[PDB]
Design a protein around this nucleic acid. Structure first.
Ligand code: ZN
Ligand code: ZN
Ligand code: ZN
Ligand code: ZN
Length: 1473
RNA sequence: GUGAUGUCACGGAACCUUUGUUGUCUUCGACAUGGGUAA
RNA sequence: UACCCAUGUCGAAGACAACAAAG
């Protein structure tokens, strides 16, 4: 006789579920199992499989109901209905049977004895306990009994740590499964109640069910009545096929960044010319096309679906890369004033190192655990007493724990669901100034401005909230709620807003019953009614305590460009650039606004370095200290791995919205003087200049106790003063003038910290002498042959501190132009044009200036020559090659079926193919033409010519014989000649012998006559014996070498041979096998057959080759193997053939190697080869072809002169001063600013604006040719030296349209430049910042700058044609004696120069000849002295002046034997004239 | 799928430390092609 | 198997090297 009451539990928060465990561990000795006794449980349908279902025990529900009953009986003085309850019986004989025992105190409401063990009737409380089944609680299950694969199908495990209060660092953690109430809100069950129980027991059960507010860690209401995989495979296959796997990770991070929107697919960058040949997105179908067809797929039209697709694809690519009781309700919103980071790692998401916590539907989550932890920390801070409570046991009774036992906080989420942003973070090596090994990672960051609903309920005996809670909530109201991790980088600062508080008296019977009836107004509907009763504001704490953190505002003025780089954003950005500045997102509504900001991590690192460089502990600078378990200044101010820091830097944002500009850079090879291979690049920094300085303003929070301390204030003041003196540039690429701090100023410190922030020798006369003759013509560039000794002895000083005896400061110099100067703005190529590229001068904010990178390059090139050093930029991997001449050792051969052997054909013959004397093309198969199948062709090696008259009147070896005349036709005689006493009889046709045929004109058929026969070399083969000469043909089997009609001459202007062509010029045929000879270059003798044609693309073609080859007499016994060196040389030859700008525009006239893009040597190939012993030296595909050098170009140079590899071989003085990849340089080159209004070379069109200038056209600036200075493969030829262009006044001649060498004209072209030049007399002032420079280093830098009276520099564009001669005068030197004191060093300059020259004497005692050579290359022409300098022309027939061209110079003056000495002796003429 | 006269698990901040940075003159002249002739 | 040269056009580089998380 029982009745069933059905119950339902609805969860308002994600609830906690336990990990499944077998019955062997379900005991009292397992910590993990007993920890989850208050959580939901997971069942197994079978023990082996994880397929199961979540359930809630009836025991947990019963315990919660009993606790609520205790509370209700306490609030009603033990009275339920008209009966009084007993104090309750909680006393068990067998303590062991109880899995757990109560460790909280039991509420007490009466002094009576508990009910008797055996009694006729029991109080309602005892009936509810179960002493009077009577009331049985059944397990609650999901409705419908659904099955799930496993716990991870319904929930995700999360880590919850425990943080020490004093240190701020965690020391332990535990995990639990969180199941979202959105997916699984309701659990249903039943309670079986016996009919004999009293009505008061049922009333108490109902009241306790309605009073139970939490269960399984969540607030609850109890009521009783393929494509991504395929895309990844395709992308990986495309990368594998094209050998572009090194771009995989960059493609994994970029594609992942596409998860924000599919619109980014159309916004992907293109090539530099606007075409779809981007080096990343057009690798292939292409990757861009794959992403395009994935974007508009019907499946991925939803934003969430596209985000999931992008995340899965990025992950796949990354893996490929490897009594009195009151309740106060406070409702408001927590708003993020900074980015925040609640850490939670997904094990299946390995692409991001640091991740934020999200809901299953990708909403940002403000967890309840973090809010409780922050509340406890803030209360402990308020009380100034840490809670020394250990886990487990009876509850702690401190002031904090008492407050926390009445506190309930709702877990919160946000409507905003955009994916988090990814930030790059690194750690710098203090000694090298570069990044440390392995210190590169990325962090997920949630945007600022996200709003979370916030509800806090406090249940306690006080009238309202305690004073501690009031003060903590007022701290949070002032925006000092630091909730999340990564606080030192200014993350996780919230402000509580729209706060309302209301107290409900649960002691009142009416209020208690109202609370019970409405379930405490904790559900979504109940909160709506409750919030109407809430009153705005917060209680004012009587004993209010000030917040522990104080805000200090920083304002930085930088008169220079700035960049905080982000390469992935650039890889995705619409405008193709190598790197772009960092941009963050802030949340507005459901949208994200991107803004440019200086990362808080970078500013924190710079400030920390500034503090550490000037301070040292116990004789050791703070940087060198291990910073483990120490009390040093750096750990006190900034924290360490042991404890949290007392300072927190926020992101500094730039005022206004400065849009970034694009600066191009190219590395200049020190040998060739031109662009180094692959070293062309872009940068997109924020533009800054003295005209419009960047203003970077932000805040950082410092703890009050530090701001009170005098020593910390003094340390921060000295560091910020050194930053204020420009000692610490912000951002990257400061070596080229970026991010120079003009001024720093802090506010809000009450002046505690800011109180600390507050004749040059004449150029020496030169000794250099250069004699110039007006007749002589000199070369544009010469080479300084360097001294063999490059000093690697010194070790580079670290950037960790300033050193005694070393000089730090700034050099202000005046750079003067002595000739026109050209520095182009290459972002736009149409400044002087309405194609022919035309560049404006370099201007920043419409101010003419020289970027620091060009000045740095020029000064570094001079410095590498003053002190002998390595060639810092040099393409060592280049392989030189030359063309053969018509002058033997190459022999025919066929590559065997193995592929590692080539046999040797004994003989070759010329088989006419493209003339009208045979039908070989018709009577040969494709396989025979290709050389696959052997063919039988008659060959003749000697033809016979005869004279009727005995040799006279003009052979040297003739055999006389009897000619029997057969016939005469076509004007040519025909007779069978029998000679060698009848041994050899052959039929031959004969041309009329001049002055001889007339004597014997009489034609007798069957005659006998006297003749003399000679043999001539006629090495030709035909498949069928020709009818004219059916004698002396030997049938031989061999292979046909057919490379096509390759020997061709293509001219824009009509050549002599094609001009005399009679008829109409035919079209170029598509099939190269149909090409037939149409004319003869020597028509008189019917030789040199030629095929002439004309086309629009290539103008006139003249193909003079009519014979293919026939390889016969193969030597199968003889073979030669192919070394890998020969194979790589042949591959280089093939790539040079295929990558040929000057190739003929018709592929029919190209060889089979070039017209069919032969990428490798394969089996069956017929080639020429030269060999040594049993291995092949060189292989060529045609008769006259390319010769490839065996060694790299860098081998032609001494190893001491090669670029330093770091990993410290050591460092040269110039590499030491300017830095390498592993060592940061100690010099920073700022932008030179033009002092006055510019005197220009050419005034522009409009006289209204005088600052702008007019166009001028340079001649063709062509690629430097290393093969000229290096005449060939001989080891005698070396790298002559470092190229330095001489000073000359060809700019005057080329100011008109006069070519430098010729002067005929300079017409526009699609391959030349137009520029505006700063005429001579322009004055710039610039500053070079240096740190830790020796005396001789400063002296030699000054010498490199000033040079001597009579010298100059060359800077900018078109140095060969007289442009860019500039001079530098050192104006002033400021030296950093101390952080507070600076003194001038103009009196110390002579000592600097003397010590530098003494160091030069030490290094090179009397071998300073290079200096003089450099000096002669730096010598500037005196008055009444104008040398003439120009490159030669191709040939003398192209030069009106009559000077010898390159073809006439390679033999003669600049012959291979003496070209190097001519080019290594400065100012050496190449034309006497 | 929990036992039952005793479960503070709202008893526990995934927390602390790290500079997207180092190096690079928007520069610049001789090369490309393969045969033809031996009346 | 031994000589002989003939033709006059043409852009190149477009990022590279390193770190890809540790304590
Ligand atoms: Zn009782
Ligand atoms: Zn406590
Ligand atoms: Zn320390
Ligand atoms: Zn070096």
């Amino acid at each position: 006789m029982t009745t069933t009451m059905k119950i339902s539990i609805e969860f308002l928060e994600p609830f906690r579920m336990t990990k499944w465990q077998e019955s062997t561990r379900r005991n009292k000795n397992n910590k993990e199992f007993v920890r989850g006794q208050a959580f939901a449980r997971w069942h197994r349908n079978k023990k082996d499989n994880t397929k199961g279902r979540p359930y809630i025990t009836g025991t947990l529900l019963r315990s919660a109901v009993i606790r609520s009953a205790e509370n209700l009986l306490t609030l009603s003085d033990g009275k339920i209905s008209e009966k009084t309850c007993c104090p309750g019986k909680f006393d068990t004989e067998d303590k062991d049977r109880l899995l757990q025992l109560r460790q909280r105190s039991t509420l007490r409401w009466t002094d009576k004895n508990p009910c008797p063990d055996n009694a006729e009737t029991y109080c309602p409380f005892c009936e509810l306990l179960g002493r009077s089944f009577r009331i049985h609680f059944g397990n609650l299950s999901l409705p419908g009994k659904p099955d799930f694969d496993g716990p991870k199908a319904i929930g995700s495990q999360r880590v919850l740590n425990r943080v020490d209060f004093k240190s701020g660092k965690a020391h332990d953690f535990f995990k639990a499964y969180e199941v979202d109430h959105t997916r699984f809100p309701r659990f249903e069950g039943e309670i079986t109640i016996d009919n004999k129980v009293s009505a008061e027991a049922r009333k108490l059960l109902c009241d306790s069910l309605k009073f139970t507010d939490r269960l399984c860690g969540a607030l609850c209401v109890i009521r009783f009545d393929n494509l991504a995989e395929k895309t990844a495979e395709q992308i990986i296959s495309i990368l594998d096929d094209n050998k572009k796997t090194e771009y995989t990770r960059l493609l994994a991070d970029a594609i992942r960044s596409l998860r924000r929107s599919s619109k980014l697919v159309a916004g992907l960058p293109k090539d530099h010319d606007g075409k779809d040949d981007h080096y990343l997105w057009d690798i292939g179908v292409t990757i861009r096309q794959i992403l395009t067809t994935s974007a508009d797929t019907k499946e991925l039209k939803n934003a969430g679906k596209w985000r999931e697709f992008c995340e899965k694809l990025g992950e796949a690519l990354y893996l490929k890369s490897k009594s009195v009781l009151k309740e106060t309700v406070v409702c408001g919103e927590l708003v993020a004033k900074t980015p925040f980071f609640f850490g939670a790692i997904d094990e299946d998401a390995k692409q991001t190192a640091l991740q934020v916590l999200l809901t299953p539907d990708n909403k940002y989550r403000l967890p309840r655990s973090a809010v409780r932890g922050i509340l406890r920390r803030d209360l402990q801070t308020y009380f100034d007493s840490p809670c020394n409570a250990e886990l487990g046991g009876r509850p702690c009774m401190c002031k904090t724990c008492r407050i926390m036992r009445g506190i309930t906080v709702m877990d919160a989420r946000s409507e905003y669901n955009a994916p988090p942003e990814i930030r790059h973070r690194t750690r710098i090596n203090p000694f090298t100034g570069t990044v440390a090994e392995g210190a590169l990672f990325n962090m997920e960051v949630a945007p600022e401005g996200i709003v979370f609903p916030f509800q806090l309920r406090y249940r306690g005996s006080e009238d309202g909230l305690p004073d501690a809670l009031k003060t903590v909530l007022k701290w949070w109201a002032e925006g000092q709620a630091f909730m999340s991790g990564a606080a030192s980088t200014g993350k996780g600062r919230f402000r509580m807003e729209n706060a309302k508080y209301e107290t409900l008296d649960l002691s009142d019977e009416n209020q208690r019953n109202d609370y019970l009836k409405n379930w405490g107004w904790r559900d979504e509907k109940g909160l709506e009614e409750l919030k109407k009763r809430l009153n705005s504001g917060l209680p004012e704490p009587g004993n209010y305590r000030d917040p522990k953190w104080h805000e200090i505002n920083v304002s930085i003025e930088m008169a220079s460009p700035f960049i905080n780089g982000d390469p992935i954003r650039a890889a995705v950005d619409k405008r193709g650039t190598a790197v772009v500045t960092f941009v963050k997102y802030k949340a507005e509504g459901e949208e994200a606004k991107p803004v440019c900001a200086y990362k808080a991590e970078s500013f924190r690192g710079v400030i920390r370095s500034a503090v550490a460089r000037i301070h040292m502990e116990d004789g050791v600078p703070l940087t060198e200290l291990t910073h483990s378990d120490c009390e040093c200044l750096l750990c006190q101010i900034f924290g360490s791995e042991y404890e949290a820091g007392k300072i927190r830097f926020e992101d500094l944002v730039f005022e206004s919205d400065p849009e970034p500009v694009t600066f191009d850079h190219v590395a200049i090879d020190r040998f060739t003087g031109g662009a180094a291979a692959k070293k062309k690049f872009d940068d997109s920094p924020l533009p800054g200049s003295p005209a419009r300085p960047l203003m970077l303003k932000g805040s950082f929070w410092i703890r009050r106790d530090v701001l009170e301390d005098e020593e910390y204030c003094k340390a921060l003041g000295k560091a910020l003063a050194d930053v204020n003196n420009g000692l610490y540039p912000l951002g990257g690429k400061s070596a080229i003038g970026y991010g120079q701090v003009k001024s720093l100023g802090i506010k809000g410190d009450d002046k505690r910290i800011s109180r600390l922030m507050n004749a040059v020798p004449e150029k020496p006369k030169t000794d250099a002498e250069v004699r110039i003759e007006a007749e002589k013509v000199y070369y544009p560039h010469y080479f300084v042959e360097p001294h063999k000794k490059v000093e690697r002895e010194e070790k580079p000083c670290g950037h960790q501190k300033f050193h005694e005896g070393r000089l730090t400061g700034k050099i202000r110099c005046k750079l003067i132009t002595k000739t026109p100067l050209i520095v182009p703005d290459t972002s736009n190529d149409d400044f002087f044009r309405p194609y022919h590229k035309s560049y404006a001068f370099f201007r920043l904010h419409k101010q003419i200036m020289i970027p620091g990178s060009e000045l740095r390059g020029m000064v570094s090139s001079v410095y590498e020559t003053v002190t002998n050093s390595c060639f810092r930029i040099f393409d060592e991997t280049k392989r030189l090659s030359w063309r053969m001449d018509a002058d033997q050792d190459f022999l025919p051969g066929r590559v065997t079926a193995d592929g590692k052997h080539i046999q040797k054909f004994s003989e070759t013959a010329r088989v006419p193919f493209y003339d009208k004397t045979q039908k070989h093309f018709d009577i040969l198969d494709e396989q025979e033409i290709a050389g696959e199948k052997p063919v039988r062709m008659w060959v003749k090696r000697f033809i016979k010519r005869l004279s009727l008259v005995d040799p006279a009147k003009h052979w040297k070896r003739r055999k006389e014989g009897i000619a029997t005349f057969i016939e005469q036709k076509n004007g040519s005689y025909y007779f069978n000649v029998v000679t060698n006493n009848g041994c050899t009889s052959f039929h031959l046709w004969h041309k009329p012998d001049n002055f001889d045929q007339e004597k014997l004109e009489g034609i007798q058929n069957g005659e006998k006559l006297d003749c003399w026969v000679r043999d001539s070399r006629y090495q030709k083969a035909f498949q069928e014996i020709p009818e004219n000469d059916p004698d002396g043909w030997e049938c031989k089997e061999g292979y046909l070498h057919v490379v096509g009609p390759s020997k061709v001459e293509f001219s824009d202007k009509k050549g002599d041979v094609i001009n005399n062509f009679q008829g109409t010029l035919p079209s170029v045929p598509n099939d190269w096998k149909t090409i037939r000879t149409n004319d003869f270059k020597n028509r008189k003798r019917k030789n040199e057959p030629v095929f002439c044609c004309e086309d629009d693309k290539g103008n006139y073609y003249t193909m003079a080759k009519y014979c293919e080859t026939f390889f016969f007499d193969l030597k199968e016994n003889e073979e030669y193997e192919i070394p890998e060196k020969a194979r790589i040389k042949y591959k280089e030859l093939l790539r040079v053939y295929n990558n040929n700008p000057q190739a003929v525009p018709e592929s029919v006239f190209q060889s089979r190697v070039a017209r069919e893009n032969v990428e490798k040597l394969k089996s069956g190939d017929l080639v020429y080869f030269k060999h040594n012993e049993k291995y092949v030296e060189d292989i060529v595909p045609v008769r006259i072809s390319r010769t490839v050098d065996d060694r790299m170009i860098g081998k032609r140079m001494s190893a001491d002169l090669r670029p330093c590899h770091g990993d410290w071989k050591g460092l040269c003085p110039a590499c030491r001063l300017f830095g390498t990849g592993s060592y940061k340089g100690r010099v920073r080159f700022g932008f030179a600013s033009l002092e006055n209004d510019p005197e220009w070379l050419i005034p522009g069109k409009n006289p209204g604006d005088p600052f702008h200038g007019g166009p001028v056209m340079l001649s063709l600036l062509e690629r430097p040719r290393p093969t000229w200075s290096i005449p060939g493969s001989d080891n005698k030829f070396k790298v002559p030296g470092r190229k330095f262009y001489v000073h000359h006044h060809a700019w005057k001649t080329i100011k008109d349209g006069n070519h430098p060498t010729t002067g005929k004209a300079i017409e526009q072209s699609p391959n030349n430049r137009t520029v505006e030049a700063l005429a001579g007399g322009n004055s710039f002032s610039f500053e070079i910042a240096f740190e830790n420079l020796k005396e001789w280093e400063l002296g030699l830098l000054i010498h490199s700058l000033q040079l001597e009276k009579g010298l100059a520099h060359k800077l900018g564009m078109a140095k060969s044609m007289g442009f860019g001669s500039v001079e530098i005068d050192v104006e002033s030197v400021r030296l950093r004696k101390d952080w507070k004191q600076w003194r001038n060093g103009n009196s110390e300059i002579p000592n600097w120069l003397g010590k530098g020259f003494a160091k030069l004497k030490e290094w090179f005692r009397d071998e300073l000849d290079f200096i003089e050579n450099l000096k002669k290359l730096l010598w500037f022409p005196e008055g009444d002295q104008a040398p003439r300098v120009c490159y030669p022309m191709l040939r003398k027939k192209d030069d009106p002046n009559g000077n010898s061209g390159y073809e006439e110079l390679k033999d003669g003056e600049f012959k291979k034997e003496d070209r190097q000495k001519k080019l290594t002796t400065p100012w050496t003429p190449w034309a006497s004239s």
